[PDB]
């Protein structure tokens, strides 16, 4: 189907403990493929997926140089932000950035993204038009004026429509065995009494990729959204994900409940029930 490439940068200051740490990671969909960590014994952009390993020395040297340059830029931005928010040099603060492109099945740009935060709050975001900005507060408006004066939006647009999509398409081809394979969930329902008159039914999905999934409980055909406990989708460590949804039901009414599973790997949504 459709695919995304996303990079994530985190810059974290630590006054008294050296210069800020800069970590960058890159993803295609839910597959991490590169990392850079300024705290590594020898910082470089490094592979994290087998299909990226075939890129040559020019690629790795180029990415490493760019990540060092970026780390310098974000260390400076942390100083700047201290001035913009009238903050002391004694605290630790974090800048985060995420950016990338989304393409459809035909490889065409669906949309581009570039968003930044300061201390976990929205700071400034490129709008979907890739030509204007949304600044979250008066500090970010200072940044917005600088970026407008420097035509930063034009440069990002050129990236997001050009190299971003081109490289994503390349990665999708080089990693097609995995990036273009959906693994459907393996599903089952467990039942555990909590008392003489209620039981938990828990609908499990395991071993699926990509992470996006919907698990819902229905009682007599009606969604039990308010009454369902849903855990966050979690990584298994072998590329796949896991998730469960639970509902507490009156004893003797278990058969009135059905779990419904939607996942890209499934030709049609699954309905399952507790099978005693």
């Amino acid at each position: 189907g459709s695919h995304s490439m996303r990079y994530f940068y985190t810059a974290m200051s630590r006054p008294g403990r050296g210069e800020p740490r800069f970590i960058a990671v890159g993803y295609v969909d839910d597959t991490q493929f590169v990392r850079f960590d300024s705290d590594a014994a020898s910082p470089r952009m490094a592979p994290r997926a087998p299909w990226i390993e075939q890129e040559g020395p020019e690629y790795w040297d180029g990415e490493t140089r760019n990540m060092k340059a970026s780390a310098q830029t974000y260390r400076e931005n942390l100083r700047i932000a201290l001035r913009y928010y009238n903050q002391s040099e004694a605290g630790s603060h974090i800048i985060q950035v995420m950016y990338g492109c989304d393409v459809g099945p035909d490889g065409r740009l669906l949309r581009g993204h570039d968003q930044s935060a300061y201390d976990g709050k929205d700071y400034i975001a490129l709008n979907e038009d890739l030509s204007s900005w949304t600044a979250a507060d008066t500090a970010a408006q200072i940044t917005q004026r600088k970026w407008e004066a420097a035509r930063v939006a034009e440069q990002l647009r050129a990236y997001l429509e050009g190299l971003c999509v081109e490289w994503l398409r390349r990665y999708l081809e080089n990693g097609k065995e995995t990036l273009q394979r959906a693994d459907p969930p393996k599903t089952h329902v467990t039942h555990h009494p909590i008392s003489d008159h209620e039981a938990t039914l828990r609908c499990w999905a395991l071993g699926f990729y990509p992470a996006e999934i919907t698990l819902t409980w229905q009682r007599d055909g009606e969604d039990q959204t308010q009454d369902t406990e849903l855990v966050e989708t979690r990584p298994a460590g072998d590329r796949t994900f896991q998730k469960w949804a639970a509902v507490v039901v009156p004893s003797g009414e278990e058969q009135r409940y059905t779990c419904h599973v939607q996942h890209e790997g499934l030709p049609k949504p699954l309905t399952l029930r507790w099978e005693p």
Partner: peptide, 9 residues
């Protein structure tokens, strides 16, 4: 491939 654009705040 990462973006190369200067983003001074």
């Amino acid at each position: 491939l990462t973006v190369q654009v200067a983003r001074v705040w």
